[PDB]
Design a protein around this ligand. Structure first.
Ligand SMILES: [Ca+2]
Ligand SMILES: [Ca+2]
Length: 288
């Protein structure tokens, strides 16, 4: 049809070598079988750092999304058409970004950001063939909270890459992921980092629906454990480049899916959670 469904989710899968008891393996199975992640055309994943759990998750998503990229910054072989940027094979961790789709992926490129405040952070570019139409999806995860200066530099690298690619102006180019750029209380400030994000990427502002935050310690069990008193934030987006096909309609809906209860043990203490990640997923609907 004339609709494209793209979802982005920071799944919080830290390395089990550093955090052995964060339920990474179990959550890989829970997310893989979750209803919220079904029925999409493309899914962008962030923080799939743990090697075993990330591969398990990707394997669980294979049935519905058999076309998959490797995980950003974990390798630099022929699994990528090109490895761009400051890639280092000596980093202690990878970039944690991967893209999966139910449609054939014509091109897969990884790009490692030049600056940061040890993990090959950057973005993954994919050219996807959806029903005789090529769409372009870039998945990324920016510098977490000077950081603003770094994020702007990273966003500039993304825009520069898109421009250099010479992608047809009549094809859709989406940029999605955890931007770590907070929208809350910044929509009216034209000099805010939030406003600057769209200008740096030369992207449009999508219609917002669903929950009012993507990282919410007031409703998310994992975020509550880590930062119980931190105000909710809006950091995840999926937006379209204005230098290419401009969607007549593009929506970003924040979902609040709860997972079956899972338990972990740490320091002789048992902890139970009902969230898939500390971030909520964003479901984008783009009219083509
Ligand atoms: Ca995080
Ligand atoms: Ca890893």
């Amino acid at each position: 049809n004339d609709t494209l469904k793209v979802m982005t989710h920071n799944v919080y899968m830290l390395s089990t070598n550093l955090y052995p008891n964060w339920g990474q393996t179990e959550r890989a199975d829970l997310i893989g079988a979750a209803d919220y992640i079904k029925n999409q055309d493309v899914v962008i994943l962030n923080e799939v750092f743990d090697n075993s759990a990330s591969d398990r998750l990707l394997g669980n998503l294979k049935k519905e999304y058999p076309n998959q990229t490797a995980v950003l910054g974990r390798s630099s072989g022929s699994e990528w058409d090109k490895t761009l940027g400051n890639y280092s094979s000596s980093t202690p961790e990878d970039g944690g970004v991967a893209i999966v789709s139910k449609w054939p992926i014509a091109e897969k490129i990884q790009y490692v950001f030049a600056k940061g405040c040890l993990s090959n952070k950057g973005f993954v570019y994919t050219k996807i063939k959806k029903n005789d139409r090529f769409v372009h999806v870039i998945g990324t995860h920016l510098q977490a909270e000077s950081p603003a200066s770094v994020r702007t530099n990273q966003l500039k690298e993304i825009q520069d890459f898109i421009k250099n690619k010479n992608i047809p102006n009549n094809e859709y180019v989406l940029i999605g992921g955890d931007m770590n750029v907070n929208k809350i209380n910044a929509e009216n400030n034209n000099d805010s980092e939030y406003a600057s994000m769209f200008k740096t990427l030369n992207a449009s502002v999508p219609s917002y629906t669903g929950h009012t935050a993507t990282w919410d310690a007031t409703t998310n069990s994992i975020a509550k454990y880590n930062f119980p008193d931190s105000p909710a934030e809006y950091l995840d987006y999926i937006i379209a480049s204005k230098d290419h096909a401009n969607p007549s309609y593009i929506e970003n809906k924040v979902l609040q899916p709860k997972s079956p209860q899972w338990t972990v043990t740490s320091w002789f203490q048992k902890y139970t959670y009902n969230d898939y990640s500390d971030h909520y997923p964003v479901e984008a609907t783009i009219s083509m």
